[PDB]
């Protein structure tokens, strides 16, 4: 046991030295040669009303028009962002939903929460009514986040510190991702759908592979539980949100933190983080009833959204970057552009 | 013309400051009731309390928007400049708002009392739908109570080309004794249904809540008794003097000594009434935490 | 300007809004309370008796008493970090906290069960989300406590305790100790009750506590409180 | 999904009849319902419509006021009360579903219809009968009096195929989305008012009449019906 | 049980140490180039006029 611990410490020190050796120059020193981004003014266009409880999760469709949102009232609503019309209203058997996802093809929508069972709802049913298609059971903890890898397979994250890849046609977990010390809080799929990163309460983030099913690379640096995570549009980097009131950018090729976003007046945690289409701007939903915009290259507060009546819990940018939506515990969902 | 409105034609009235400045009440009522009807009307999830607040604000706004015409009536020389259409509609809509606000405050007090005397009943059998129907039924009585007064409105002609548009009580079914009896009946009816009965209902409701809390072994915070006293004062002080002067005017038939005081004092009490109109928001809207937060957020946005 | 299908979609959206409003109005009538405590605290017996009167994850129990609907949620099986999902119950009406009274001298693999229960009660009551949420306390092991105190003294658990060995003084001391943990007496109160073989008494006490909480909420909603 | 219509037969001109369509196998409540008649050797014609929850009911000018359509969601039955029947009213009335939302496909299912006999935007088709052997591509041209393209950025065009002894089947809706279950051989396009339906390779199942329909104005109209046969 | 945990931990640490790495400067330059290239197609950074913005007054 002692020799194993000594070997682990030696490997950790070697990894630290290797990561430090690659830190030839910081992102700030390189990005200082370009002019800063001006004040970004985003005005609220549509106000999606209809929810009667706290908003906890939302996801944009591949068409950049439809979006699904989850609330503690137990009602999933698919909104038409261009007309503010509810496309569907799905009554959930368990109102304690905490995450939701929209399939890339737009034919299925998934959600989860304190029920420890991921419900897969079909929208293109011939019967004409949205009925639960599959119910993935097996998780010993609450579902923190879920994302559709493909129309056939789906990945889910539970509170038991282990993620599982479930096949829709089969219904049995094929790959089980283990290694997290803390409860995995959020997931984010890379553009190629080959690699995905996950944040846990142990302040670390780990890069996992789909086919291999092992921890490809681990990341650290946060002083608190990682609350949010999102892949950079290029697919070689990802930002992370945590309760210590700061965002940290990590690179999968450099294996270290690139830049840290923080401000003195900000002391509360972060709920959600999402990059824009080009990745030039970074949005992070803070607990102080508002969301701030950060310069991905200079860390300057390029701008801030007006704000909601309660904690901003979720947000997401369309696949075309035409607009960004922000959810809040005030039961309202606004789209900014 | 009848003795009262006949003798009042013979009047010869730094004195235009008080009655003129009352336009501040109109401005404040318009602003507040509009901001409330807009924000609480479509920017907040509807509830029974919100329904009562919206209807009270609508009644107040209807009352507030009617003041400019009365302000011009006063400024032009305490006389009118309009065809009978407008005296009658301006006066009828005025009494409409009085009974409307009275019944709405009585309903609010009854709902507050019910929430405490029968918690389960209010939790189960109280809905926004029933509240709207009950409130619409309340408005029906106000419009019904205004028909008599509307029918008894005609431009009394002061001799020197001035007008008083009030109480020609003998327009229908005509004389001195009949007019006196009908005027006294109208005065008693309004005093009972608009001031006495609503105030008594409000008082009994606020008392039952206090007595009910005392029986359950729970103390009342300073905000409770203070707000109750504030509401009681606002309701009794705004309309109180107006109804008192109306009763005095109705009694002026047998007591001519009251006519001089009524002539000079009556025009000043009706404005305290349009001012109560202005208040209600402070006590029934700005006191709710959620409503206050919504209003402050809408203000910060602007 | 809306086409033939846009108007139909708007009408369908309005119908969906009406249905959602109706569901909210219907759901708001039922009371929502949270059940907490250890496994050996007797929560199972409480749930069983309440159901008679009327797998991993959280259990939701529905029951009605005196025409009042209740929704009880059990999160004991949720063996995960609570501070990351406990905030979901911010709108809960009350909290049912059960503690094993007779386990004062039992050991837990804090080392003592009563100390751990007190720590959990302090963490839940003084939580930032439950600043105003009332808590109902039940002692589901008073009979075992009476049967054991005659043989095993209470000083083993509370050395500072020096009162009489009788059951009344011990129960009063435990009640005072558990009540003193409420650091927010100005905004919230604790409803303590001793559970016994009789089941209707506990349901009536819960009903009374919920009625008091509903009265307080209604008085706050209209600005009185 | 199944629609069973009942009622019809020989009726007198001044008589009355009450058609009954029993719906089952789907959310009858959420779906809309249309009545489309088809006289012998004549194209389809829209009769009436009921929106979800009976919130909006529309009638055609040819039957406005004479026919009475009602809906019963609890029982899931569609009734069409006809108090007066002219000679031209003889036709088979088909019940059709219609649900309206972004990405929906209205008029996707057609009932078997019932035979009843008695004792606006114009849609035109260039060619009616185009004899062509199976395997060769086919093209059906269509023209509308008014531009079906709405400012929102989509065209409200529908194509239906009615085979001998079978109700019409939705091929393509909104001119750009292929209906579910229809082979990919069918393709449709247009520009403002000139629309064209192209078929890669004609097969035996393609034998039938193709009916074009516009959905820009609620008073729907159908074309003459292009017939194809080996 | 601690032996298996320690073995798995050391194995994972050894695996994560074998992966290749690049200079931070090169990754930063690549990200800057990617952003500058895609900046011309990001409506959030470059607000598009109303003629193209699909979000307008209803
Ligand atoms: C001038 C003074 C002000 C006027 C008075 C206003 C008082 C303040 C009002 C606040 C608004 C809330 C009160 C109205 C709430 C509606 C009550 C209602 O009608 O529905 C109760 C049952 O609820 C329903 O299921 C049906 C609801 C469907 C909407 C019907 C609303 C109609 C209200 C219009 C009243 C007009 C008054 C006008 C006054 C100027 C009535 O039944 P009830 O309570 O008597 O009996 C019950 C219980 O006894 C049983 O326990 C139970 O088993 C049940 O079966 C039985 O039916
Ligand atoms: C209160 C709103 C009145 C609208 C304008 C109306 O024409 C009144 C005009 C004034 C006059 O002509 C003389 C008199 O001083 C009156 C204003 C004061 C009125 C008490 C109204 C009697 C009533 O209770 O009915």
């Amino acid at each position: 046991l002692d020799q194993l611990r000594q070997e682990a410490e030696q490997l950790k020190n070697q990894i630290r030295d290797a990561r430090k050796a690659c830190a030839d120059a910081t992102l700030s020193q390189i990005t200082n040669n370009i002019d800063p981004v001006g004040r970004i003014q985003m005005r609220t266009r549509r106000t999606l009303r209809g929810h009667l409880a706290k908003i906890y999760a939302m996801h944009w469709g591949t068409d950049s028009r439809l979006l699904v949102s989850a609330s503690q009232d137990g009602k999933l609503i698919i909104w038409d962002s261009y007309t503010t019309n509810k496309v569907h209203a799905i009554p959930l058997r368990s109102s304690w939903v905490m995450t939701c996802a929209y399939a890339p093809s737009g034919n299925y929508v998934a959600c989860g929460g304190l029920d420890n069972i991921c419900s897969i709802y079909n929208l293109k049913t011939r019967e004409g009514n949205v009925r639960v298609s599959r119910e993935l059971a097996g998780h010993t903890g609450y579902l923190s986040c879920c994302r559709f890898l493909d129309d056939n397979q789906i990945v889910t994250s539970s509170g038991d510190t282990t993620c599982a890849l479930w096949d829709i046609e089969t219904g049995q977990q094929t790959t089980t991702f283990t290694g997290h010390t803390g409860d995995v809080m959020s997931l984010s799929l890379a553009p190629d759908t080959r690699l995905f990163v996950s944040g846990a309460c142990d302040a670390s983030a780990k890069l996992w592979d789909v086919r291999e099913g092992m921890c490809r690379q681990t990341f650290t640096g946060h002083e608190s539980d990682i609350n949010a995570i999102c892949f950079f549009p290029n697919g070689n980097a990802f930002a992370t949100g945590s309760d210590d009131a700061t965002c940290r950018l990590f690179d999968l090729r450099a294996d270290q933190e690139l830049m840290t976003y923080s401000h003195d007046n900000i002391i509360c945690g972060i709920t959600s983080v999402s990059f824009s289409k080009s990745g030039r701007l970074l949005l992070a939903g803070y607990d102080d009833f508002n969301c701030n915009v950060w310069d991905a290259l200079k860390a300057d507060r390029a701008g801030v959204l007006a704000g909601h009546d309660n904690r901003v819990s979720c947000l997401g940018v369309t696949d075309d970057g035409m607009a960004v939506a922000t959810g809040s515990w005030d039961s309202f969902l606004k789209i900014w552009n | 013309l009848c003795p009262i409105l006949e003798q009042m034609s013979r009047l010869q009235s730094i004195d235009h400051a008080a009655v003129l400045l009352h336009g501040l009440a109109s401005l404040l009522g318009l602003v507040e009731n509009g901001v409330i009807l807009f924000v609480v009307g479509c920017r907040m999830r509807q509830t029974v309390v919100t329904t009562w607040v919206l209807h009270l604000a609508l009644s107040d706004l209807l009352a507030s928007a009617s003041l400019p015409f009365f302000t011009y009536f006063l400024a032009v020389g305490h006389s009118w400049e309009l065809g009978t259409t407008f005296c009658k509609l301006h006066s009828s809509i005025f009494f409409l708002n009085m009974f409307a606000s009275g019944f709405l405050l009585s309903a609010i007090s009854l709902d507050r009392c019910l929430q405490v005397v029968r918690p389960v009943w209010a939790q189960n059998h109280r809905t926004v739908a029933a509240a709207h129907k009950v409130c619409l039924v309340l408005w029906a009585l106000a419009v019904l109570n205004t028909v008599p007064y509307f029918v008894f409105r005609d431009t009394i002609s002061r001799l020197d080309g001035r007008i008083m548009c009030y109480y020609n009580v003998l327009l229908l079914n005509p004389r001195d004794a009949t007019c006196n009896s009908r005027q006294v009946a109208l005065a008693v009816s309004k005093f009972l249904l608009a001031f006495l009965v609503p105030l008594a209902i409000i008082a009994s409701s606020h008392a039952a809540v206090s007595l009910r809390l005392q029986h359950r072994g729970r103390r009342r915070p300073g905000r409770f008794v203070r707000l109750v006293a504030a509401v009681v004062a606002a309701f009794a002080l705004c309309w109180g003097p107006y109804h008192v002067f109306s009763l005095l005017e109705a009694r002026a038939h047998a007591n001519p000594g009251l006519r001089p005081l009524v002539w000079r004092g009556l025009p000043f009490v009706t404005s305290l009434a349009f001012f109560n109109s202005v208040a209600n928001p402070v006590l029934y809207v700005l006191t709710c935490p959620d409503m206050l937060r919504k209003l402050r957020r809408s203000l910060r946005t602007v | 300007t809306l086409s033939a299908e846009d108007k139909a979609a708007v009408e369908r959206s309005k119908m969906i809004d009406r249905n959602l409003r109706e569901d909210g109005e219907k759901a708001a009538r039922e009371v929502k309370l949270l059940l907490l405590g250890a496994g050996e605290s007797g929560k199972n017996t409480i749930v069983k008796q309440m159901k008679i009167i009327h797998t991993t994850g959280i259990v939701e129990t529905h029951f009605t008493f005196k025409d009042l609907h209740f929704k009880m949620f059990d999160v004991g099986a949720q063996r995960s970090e609570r501070k990351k999902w406990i905030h979901c119950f911010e709108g809960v009406t009350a909290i049912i906290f059960c503690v094993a009274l007779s386990d004062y001298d039992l050991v837990l693999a804090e080392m003592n069960r009563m100390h751990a229960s007190m720590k959990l009660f302090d963490s839940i009551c003084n939580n930032k989300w439950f600043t105003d949420t009332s808590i109902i306390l039940f002692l589901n092991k008073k009979d075992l406590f009476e049967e054991k105190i005659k043989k095993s003294p209470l000083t083993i658990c509370y050395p500072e305790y020096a009162g009489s060995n009788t059951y009344e003084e011990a129960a009063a001391y435990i009640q005072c100790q558990f009540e003193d943990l409420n650091k927010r007496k100005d905004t919230k109160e604790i409803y303590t009750h001793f559970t016994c073989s009789t089941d209707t008494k506990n349901v009536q006490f819960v009903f009374d506590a919920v009625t008091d909480v509903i009265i307080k909420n209604n008085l706050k909603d209209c600005g009185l409180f | 999904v199944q629609l069973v219509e009942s009622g019809g037969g020989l009726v007198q001109p001044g008589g009355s009849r009450k058609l009954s369509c029993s719906a089952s196998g789907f959310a009858f409540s959420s779906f809309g319902m249309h009545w489309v008649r088809q006289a012998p050797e004549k194209g389809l014609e829209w009769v009436a419509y009921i929106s979800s929850g009976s919130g909006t009911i529309y009638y055609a000018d040819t039957v406005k006021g004479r026919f009475t359509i009602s809906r019963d969601d609890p029982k899931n039955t569609l009734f069409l009360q006809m108090t007066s029947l002219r000679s031209e009213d003889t036709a088979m009335y088909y019940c059709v579903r219609s649900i309206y939302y972004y990405g929906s496909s209205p008029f996707d299912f057609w009932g078997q219809g019932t035979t009843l006999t008695v004792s606006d935007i114009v849609m035109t088709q260039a060619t009616s009968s185009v004899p062509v052997t199976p395997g060769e591509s086919v093209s059906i041209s269509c023209r509308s009096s008014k531009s079906l393209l709405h400012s929102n950025g989509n065209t409200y065009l529908y194509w239906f195929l009615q085979r001998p002894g079978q109700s019409p089947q939705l091929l393509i809706y909104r001119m750009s989305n292929l209906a579910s279950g229809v082979p990919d051989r069918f393709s449709g396009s247009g520009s403002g008012t000139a629309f064209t339906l192209t078929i890669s390779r004609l097969e035996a199942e393609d034998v039938g009449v193709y009916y074009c329909m516009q959905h820009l104005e609620y008073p729907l109209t159908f074309g003459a019906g292009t017939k194809l046969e080996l | 049980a601690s032996i298996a945990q320690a073995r798995k931990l050391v194995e994972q640490l050894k695996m994560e140490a074998n992966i290749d790495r690049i200079k931070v400067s090169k990754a930063a330059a690549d990200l800057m180039a990617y952003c500058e290239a895609h900046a011309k197609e990001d409506p959030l950074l470059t607000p598009v006029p109303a003629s193209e913005n699909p979000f307008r007054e209803k």
Side-chain angles (χ1 to χ4, degrees), chain C residues 1-9 11-12 15, chain D residues 51-52 55-56 100 150 156 158 174 215-216 218:
Chain C
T1 178
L2 301 179
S3 62
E5 297 186 4
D6 292 330
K7 295 181 290 185
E11 183 178 0
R12 185 170 179 273
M15 292 177 63
Chain D
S51 181
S52 60
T56 301
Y100 296 95
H150 192 259
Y156 295 106
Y158 295 78
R174 300 195 182 88
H215 200 289
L216 181 62
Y218 248 102

Tab-separated table of all heavy atoms in Angstrom, chain C residues 1-9 11-12 15, chain D residues 51-52 55-56 100 150 156 158 174 215-216 218:
chain	number	residue	atom	x	y	z
C	1	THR	N	-52.060	39.104	-40.174
C	1	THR	CA	-50.942	38.728	-41.087
C	1	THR	C	-50.623	37.239	-40.986
C	1	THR	O	-50.004	36.666	-41.882
C	1	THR	CB	-49.665	39.539	-40.782
C	1	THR	OG1	-48.608	39.121	-41.654
C	1	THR	CG2	-49.234	39.351	-39.332
C	2	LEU	N	-51.048	36.616	-39.889
C	2	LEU	CA	-50.799	35.195	-39.689
C	2	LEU	C	-51.574	34.376	-40.715
C	2	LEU	O	-52.732	34.676	-41.019
C	2	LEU	CB	-51.195	34.784	-38.272
C	2	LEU	CG	-50.475	35.512	-37.134
C	2	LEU	CD1	-50.989	35.033	-35.785
C	2	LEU	CD2	-48.968	35.323	-37.232
C	3	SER	N	-50.930	33.340	-41.247
C	3	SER	CA	-51.554	32.493	-42.250
C	3	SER	C	-52.586	31.571	-41.603
C	3	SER	O	-52.862	31.640	-40.402
C	3	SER	CB	-50.496	31.675	-42.990
C	3	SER	OG	-49.812	30.805	-42.104
C	4	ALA	N	-53.163	30.692	-42.426
C	4	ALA	CA	-54.189	29.781	-41.930
C	4	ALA	C	-53.637	28.830	-40.877
C	4	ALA	O	-54.331	28.516	-39.902
C	4	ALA	CB	-54.794	28.992	-43.090
C	5	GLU	N	-52.401	28.361	-41.049
C	5	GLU	CA	-51.805	27.436	-40.094
C	5	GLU	C	-51.214	28.143	-38.883
C	5	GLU	O	-51.201	27.569	-37.787
C	5	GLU	CB	-50.716	26.602	-40.775
C	5	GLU	CG	-51.228	25.714	-41.895
C	5	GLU	CD	-50.158	24.791	-42.443
C	5	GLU	OE1	-49.035	24.788	-41.896
C	5	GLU	OE2	-50.440	24.066	-43.420
C	6	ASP	N	-50.726	29.372	-39.051
C	6	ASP	CA	-50.192	30.115	-37.914
C	6	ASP	C	-51.280	30.391	-36.884
C	6	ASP	O	-51.047	30.291	-35.674
C	6	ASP	CB	-49.558	31.421	-38.395
C	6	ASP	CG	-48.301	31.191	-39.211
C	6	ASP	OD1	-47.601	30.188	-38.959
C	6	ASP	OD2	-48.012	32.015	-40.105
C	7	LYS	N	-52.484	30.735	-37.347
C	7	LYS	CA	-53.583	30.982	-36.419
C	7	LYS	C	-53.982	29.706	-35.687
C	7	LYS	O	-54.275	29.735	-34.486
C	7	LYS	CB	-54.777	31.572	-37.168
C	7	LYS	CG	-54.513	32.954	-37.749
C	7	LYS	CD	-55.732	33.515	-38.464
C	7	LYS	CE	-56.025	32.764	-39.752
C	7	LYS	NZ	-57.150	33.378	-40.511
C	8	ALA	N	-53.996	28.574	-36.393
C	8	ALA	CA	-54.294	27.304	-35.737
C	8	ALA	C	-53.235	26.967	-34.695
C	8	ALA	O	-53.555	26.477	-33.605
C	8	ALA	CB	-54.400	26.188	-36.775
C	9	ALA	N	-51.964	27.225	-35.012
C	9	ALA	CA	-50.900	26.976	-34.045
C	9	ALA	C	-51.042	27.881	-32.829
C	9	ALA	O	-50.810	27.447	-31.694
C	9	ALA	CB	-49.536	27.175	-34.704
C	11	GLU	N	-53.859	29.112	-31.684
C	11	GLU	CA	-54.994	28.596	-30.925
C	11	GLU	C	-54.591	27.374	-30.109
C	11	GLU	O	-54.980	27.230	-28.943
C	11	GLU	CB	-56.145	28.259	-31.874
C	11	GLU	CG	-57.403	27.770	-31.177
C	11	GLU	CD	-58.534	27.491	-32.147
C	11	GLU	OE1	-58.335	27.683	-33.365
C	11	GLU	OE2	-59.622	27.081	-31.691
C	12	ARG	N	-53.810	26.474	-30.711
C	12	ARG	CA	-53.342	25.298	-29.984
C	12	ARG	C	-52.444	25.698	-28.820
C	12	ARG	O	-52.510	25.102	-27.739
C	12	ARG	CB	-52.610	24.355	-30.937
C	12	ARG	CG	-52.186	23.035	-30.312
C	12	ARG	CD	-51.694	22.059	-31.370
C	12	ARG	NE	-51.263	20.787	-30.794
C	12	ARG	CZ	-50.037	20.543	-30.338
C	12	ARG	NH1	-49.101	21.482	-30.382
C	12	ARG	NH2	-49.745	19.352	-29.833
C	15	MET	N	-54.652	26.912	-26.065
C	15	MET	CA	-55.273	25.775	-25.392
C	15	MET	C	-54.285	25.097	-24.448
C	15	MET	O	-54.641	24.708	-23.329
C	15	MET	CB	-55.800	24.779	-26.425
C	15	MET	CG	-56.978	25.294	-27.237
C	15	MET	SD	-57.517	24.131	-28.507
C	15	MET	CE	-58.047	22.746	-27.502
D	51	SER	N	-61.719	22.919	-35.343
D	51	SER	CA	-60.423	22.973	-34.687
D	51	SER	C	-60.452	22.172	-33.386
D	51	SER	O	-61.499	21.706	-32.929
D	51	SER	CB	-60.026	24.423	-34.410
D	51	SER	OG	-58.751	24.491	-33.796
D	52	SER	N	-59.273	22.013	-32.788
D	52	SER	CA	-59.160	21.273	-31.538
D	52	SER	C	-60.016	21.920	-30.457
D	52	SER	O	-59.954	23.133	-30.239
D	52	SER	CB	-57.697	21.216	-31.094
D	52	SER	OG	-57.172	22.517	-30.895
D	55	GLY	N	-62.927	25.042	-30.927
D	55	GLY	CA	-62.703	26.463	-30.728
D	55	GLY	C	-62.872	27.288	-31.985
D	55	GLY	O	-63.175	28.482	-31.903
D	56	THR	N	-62.682	26.679	-33.153
D	56	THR	CA	-62.812	27.375	-34.428
D	56	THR	C	-63.458	26.431	-35.430
D	56	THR	O	-62.924	25.351	-35.699
D	56	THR	CB	-61.451	27.853	-34.943
D	56	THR	OG1	-60.853	28.730	-33.980
D	56	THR	CG2	-61.603	28.586	-36.269
D	100	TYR	N	-52.062	21.092	-36.362
D	100	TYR	CA	-51.312	22.261	-36.808
D	100	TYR	C	-50.243	22.611	-35.783
D	100	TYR	O	-50.561	22.995	-34.652
D	100	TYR	CB	-52.245	23.453	-37.036
D	100	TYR	CG	-53.255	23.232	-38.138
D	100	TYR	CD1	-54.538	22.785	-37.854
D	100	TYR	CD2	-52.925	23.473	-39.465
D	100	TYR	CE1	-55.464	22.582	-38.861
D	100	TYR	CE2	-53.843	23.272	-40.479
D	100	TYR	CZ	-55.111	22.827	-40.171
D	100	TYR	OH	-56.029	22.627	-41.176
D	150	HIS	N	-45.939	32.315	-48.346
D	150	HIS	CA	-46.261	33.290	-47.316
D	150	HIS	C	-45.001	34.014	-46.859
D	150	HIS	O	-43.878	33.530	-47.024
D	150	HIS	CB	-46.944	32.610	-46.125
D	150	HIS	CG	-47.561	33.567	-45.153
D	150	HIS	ND1	-46.955	33.916	-43.966
D	150	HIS	CD2	-48.731	34.248	-45.193
D	150	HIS	CE1	-47.725	34.771	-43.316
D	150	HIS	NE2	-48.808	34.989	-44.039
D	156	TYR	N	-47.501	26.851	-48.852
D	156	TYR	CA	-48.546	25.939	-48.385
D	156	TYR	C	-49.153	25.173	-49.563
D	156	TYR	O	-50.205	25.519	-50.100
D	156	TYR	CB	-49.614	26.710	-47.618
D	156	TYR	CG	-49.121	27.333	-46.332
D	156	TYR	CD1	-48.905	28.700	-46.237
D	156	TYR	CD2	-48.879	26.552	-45.210
D	156	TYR	CE1	-48.457	29.274	-45.062
D	156	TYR	CE2	-48.431	27.115	-44.032
D	156	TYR	CZ	-48.223	28.476	-43.962
D	156	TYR	OH	-47.776	29.042	-42.790
D	158	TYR	N	-49.940	21.053	-51.017
D	158	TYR	CA	-50.121	19.658	-50.644
D	158	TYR	C	-50.440	18.831	-51.881
D	158	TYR	O	-51.096	19.304	-52.813
D	158	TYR	CB	-51.244	19.495	-49.611
D	158	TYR	CG	-50.951	20.148	-48.280
D	158	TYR	CD1	-51.085	21.519	-48.114
D	158	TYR	CD2	-50.545	19.391	-47.190
D	158	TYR	CE1	-50.818	22.120	-46.899
D	158	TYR	CE2	-50.277	19.983	-45.971
D	158	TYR	CZ	-50.415	21.347	-45.832
D	158	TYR	OH	-50.149	21.943	-44.620
D	174	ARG	N	-46.393	21.092	-47.811
D	174	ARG	CA	-45.645	22.351	-47.798
D	174	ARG	C	-44.590	22.397	-48.902
D	174	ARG	O	-43.676	23.224	-48.871
D	174	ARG	CB	-45.002	22.598	-46.430
D	174	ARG	CG	-45.999	22.681	-45.283
D	174	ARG	CD	-45.372	23.290	-44.040
D	174	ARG	NE	-46.310	23.341	-42.921
D	174	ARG	CZ	-46.493	22.357	-42.045
D	174	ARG	NH1	-45.805	21.228	-42.147
D	174	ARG	NH2	-47.371	22.504	-41.061
D	215	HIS	N	-53.217	25.543	-49.045
D	215	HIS	CA	-53.610	25.736	-47.654
D	215	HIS	C	-53.228	27.129	-47.177
D	215	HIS	O	-52.967	27.354	-45.992
D	215	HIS	CB	-52.982	24.669	-46.758
D	215	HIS	CG	-53.679	24.497	-45.445
D	215	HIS	ND1	-53.627	25.444	-44.445
D	215	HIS	CD2	-54.444	23.487	-44.967
D	215	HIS	CE1	-54.330	25.025	-43.408
D	215	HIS	NE2	-54.836	23.841	-43.698
D	216	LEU	N	-53.190	28.093	-48.100
D	216	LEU	CA	-52.934	29.476	-47.713
D	216	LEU	C	-54.183	30.121	-47.125
D	216	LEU	O	-54.101	30.841	-46.124
D	216	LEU	CB	-52.440	30.277	-48.919
D	216	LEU	CG	-52.109	31.749	-48.657
D	216	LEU	CD1	-50.982	31.881	-47.645
D	216	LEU	CD2	-51.750	32.456	-49.955
D	218	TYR	N	-58.184	29.306	-45.717
D	218	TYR	CA	-58.992	28.221	-45.174
D	218	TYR	C	-60.003	27.688	-46.188
D	218	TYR	O	-60.286	26.483	-46.181
D	218	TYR	CB	-59.712	28.674	-43.902
D	218	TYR	CG	-59.198	27.991	-42.656
D	218	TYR	CD1	-58.336	28.642	-41.784
D	218	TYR	CD2	-59.570	26.687	-42.357
D	218	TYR	CE1	-57.862	28.014	-40.645
D	218	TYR	CE2	-59.102	26.052	-41.222
D	218	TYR	CZ	-58.249	26.719	-40.369
D	218	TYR	OH	-57.782	26.087	-39.240
